[PDB]
Amino acid sequence: ILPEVKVEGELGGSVTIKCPLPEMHVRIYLCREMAGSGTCGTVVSTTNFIKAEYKGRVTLKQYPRKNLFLVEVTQLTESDSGVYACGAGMNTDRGKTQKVTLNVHS
Amino acid sequence: REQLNLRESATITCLVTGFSPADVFVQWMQRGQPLSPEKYVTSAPMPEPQAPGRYFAHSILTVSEEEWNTGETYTCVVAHEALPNRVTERTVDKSTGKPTLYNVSLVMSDTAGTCY
Amino acid sequence: REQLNLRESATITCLVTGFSPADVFVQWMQRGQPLSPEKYVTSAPMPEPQAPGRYFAHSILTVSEEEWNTGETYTCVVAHEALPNRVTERTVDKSTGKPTLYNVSLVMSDTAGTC
Amino acid sequence: LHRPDVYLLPPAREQLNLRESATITCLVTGFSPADVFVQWMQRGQPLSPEKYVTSAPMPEPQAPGRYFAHSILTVSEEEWNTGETYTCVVAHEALPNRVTERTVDKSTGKPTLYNVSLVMSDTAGTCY
Amino acid sequence: ERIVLVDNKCKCARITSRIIRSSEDPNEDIVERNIRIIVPLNNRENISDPTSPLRTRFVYHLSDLCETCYTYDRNKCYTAVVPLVYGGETKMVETALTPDACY
Numbered sequence A: 001i002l003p004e005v006k007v008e009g010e011l012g013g014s015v016t017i018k019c020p021l022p023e024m025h026v027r028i029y030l031c032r033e034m035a036g037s038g039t040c041g042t043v044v045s046t047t048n049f050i051k052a053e054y055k056g057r058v059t060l061k062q063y064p065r066k067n068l069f070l071v072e073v074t075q076l077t078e079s080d081s082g083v084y085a086c087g088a089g090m091n092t093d094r095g096k097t098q099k100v101t102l103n104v105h106s
Numbered sequence B: 001r002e003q004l005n006l007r008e009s010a011t012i013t014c015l016v017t018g019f020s021p022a023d024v025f026v027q028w029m030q031r032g033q034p035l036s037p038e039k040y041v042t043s044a045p046m047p048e049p050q051a052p053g054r055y056f057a058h059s060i061l062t063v064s065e066e067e068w069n070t071g072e073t074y075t076c077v078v079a080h081e082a083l084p085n086r087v088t089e090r091t092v093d094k095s096t097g098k099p100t101l102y103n104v105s106l107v108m109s110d111t112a113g114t115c116y
Numbered sequence C: 001r002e003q004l005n006l007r008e009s010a011t012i013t014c015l016v017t018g019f020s021p022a023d024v025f026v027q028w029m030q031r032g033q034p035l036s037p038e039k040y041v042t043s044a045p046m047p048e049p050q051a052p053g054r055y056f057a058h059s060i061l062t063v064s065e066e067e068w069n070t071g072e073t074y075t076c077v078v079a080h081e082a083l084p085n086r087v088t089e090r091t092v093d094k095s096t097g098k099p100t101l102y103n104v105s106l107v108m109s110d111t112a113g114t115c
Numbered sequence D: 001l002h003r004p005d006v007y008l009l010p011p012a013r014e015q016l017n018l019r020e021s022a023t024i025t026c027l028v029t030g031f032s033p034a035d036v037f038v039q040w041m042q043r044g045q046p047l048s049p050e051k052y053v054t055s056a057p058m059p060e061p062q063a064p065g066r067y068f069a070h071s072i073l074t075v076s077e078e079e080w081n082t083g084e085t086y087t088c089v090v091a092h093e094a095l096p097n098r099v100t101e102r103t104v105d106k107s108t109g110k111p112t113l114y115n116v117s118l119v120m121s122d123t124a125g126t127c128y
Numbered sequence E: 001e002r003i004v005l006v007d008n009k010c011k012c013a014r015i016t017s018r019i020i021r022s023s024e025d026p027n028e029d030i031v032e033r034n035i036r037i038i039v040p041l042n043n044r045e046n047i048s049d050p051t052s053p054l055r056t057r058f059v060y061h062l063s064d065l066c067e068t069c070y071t072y073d074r075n076k077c078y079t080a081v082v083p084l085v086y087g088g089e090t091k092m093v094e095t096a097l098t099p100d101a102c103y
């Protein structure tokens, strides 16, 4: 198992998410896994991709020096809530490395 | 599946995708023996609407139905600068290409054993 | 179990413990009565570091695996002069433990699982 | 001249029904010529010699040149809720590493609830 | 809580164990043992040669786990050699059978 870091928002406007950056892997995603089936749907990932809904409010900045990657999301709405994950490899499910939760008190 | 219903000839494809820049090189061999360049056709790199500055290409090989139904194995080797080994390959046959049977022989023993 | 799976003669021990005064005559029999009792070896009584007035013993019986894994029980007997009938005996075998039920949970769904 | 084979056994199931104590037995066999002694350490700390009682080397029932010995130790019944694993050890000249630490714990032993959960998929080509 | 006895990656077997507390008593503390194998289904017989027939039989001697192999590992590269006839020059080249894990 791997950590279950949790973050909150304290009313909308901005939010910041951090996950560990593995080595020797080129793909990095933050799929939301908020589906009844459970199959995680990649939201924002490298190798060129993005979410039909999440556009212009999502960006990724990988930092090998700190062994971390940073994703910045502007504003906030009702849809982009729940939980989120992080990982690598070429299999969104079975390749996760964290389970973060997103909530807003607004 | 519908093509095999006709029991005439079978066509195997190989879709390379999302390589920048262009000029990928593709070849086909059957059970470890390379085939003639005239038995298959290769496309040319074309732009990718979904991905800016990305290219893709196709390749098809045609063989008789009997050959496909004799467990013969075919592979699609490709060569590109990005490839770490500069060469990679994928392989399929009758049993692996969307099969109609999953024959399995799961067998375990000494489940108790001595485990430490 | 590490002794059984290594293809070595299984050894069964009878831990006679707590008899006072120091006099005991352990015996090993199969199918009803003992056969060549020298087959096994036993030890003399010895003290304990606890309680005033106690003695313990031991016994080892060596049997091949093709017999231990297939039938018989090899009961042990203890002959102390304070027993209700002067004779007491215990017995073990392969199935002297617990049923140990299984809970097989085979899954053939390629969509969900694998975790 | 053969490797001294060694084994360890846990307390009896019916022994854990009077709530007084428990015994753990470490059996040492072989070691020709007979040169062994056992020291019962727990967590790397040797126990008092008054607890374990080694007796003597004894020839095996059929003894061309082989021998054997038995050594037990007494513990408290209420301490087995945590185990502590009560390690055993043997020493002999016919051993490449002259130590064969042997230890068991409540967890080690016979299982009473098997729970096999095998799964079948087509994306298991690589073990993540 | 659960300790791990086997973590084989070639057979994806994860043998573990746990003891569950009884109903407020130190007796009948039943022990457990969990086994989880994940069959590949789409892998070949000779995992490093993409010509051998498909893998039908799966034999699991649990004693050995606690050499023919079944699955790949997320931390290793598999390679092979193939003939290329570019310019009528048969030539052997190392091919990354499992790419993205050879970087």
Ligand SMILES: *[C@@H]1O[C@H](CO)[C@@H](O[C@@H]2O[C@H](CO)[C@@H](O)[C@H](O)[C@H]2NC(C)=O)[C@H](O)[C@H]1NC(C)=O
Binding pocket: E046, E048, E049
């Ligand atoms: C599985 O495939 C491997 C690779 O072809 C076989 O081992 C190779 O054998 C050739 C000669 O036949 C050598 O040139 C290679 O060096 C070998 N590979 C390695 C990694 O040493 C192997 O024998 C095959 N197994 C079976 C059962 O056929």
Ligand SMILES: *[C@@H]1O[C@H](CO)[C@@H](O)[C@H](O)[C@H]1NC(C)=O
Binding pocket: B103, B104, B105, E056
């Ligand atoms: C299916 O498996 C059985 C053995 O379980 C074997 O006899 C049979 O040949 C297999 N089917 C095919 C098509 O190979």
Ligand SMILES: *[C@@H]1O[C@H](CO)[C@@H](O)[C@H](O)[C@H]1NC(C)=O
Binding pocket: C103, C105, D113
């Ligand atoms: C049997 O397995 C199920 C899960 O498949 C579990 O809920 C149940 O506790 C198991 N039975 C026992 C007696 O442990």
Ligand SMILES: *[C@@H]1O[C@H](CO)[C@@H](O)[C@H](O)[C@H]1NC(C)=O
Binding pocket: C103, C105, D115, D117, E032, E034
């Ligand atoms: C048996 O295994 C399944 C799958 O891991 C698990 O859900 C269940 O709780 C287990 N049962 C017991 C009693 O541990």
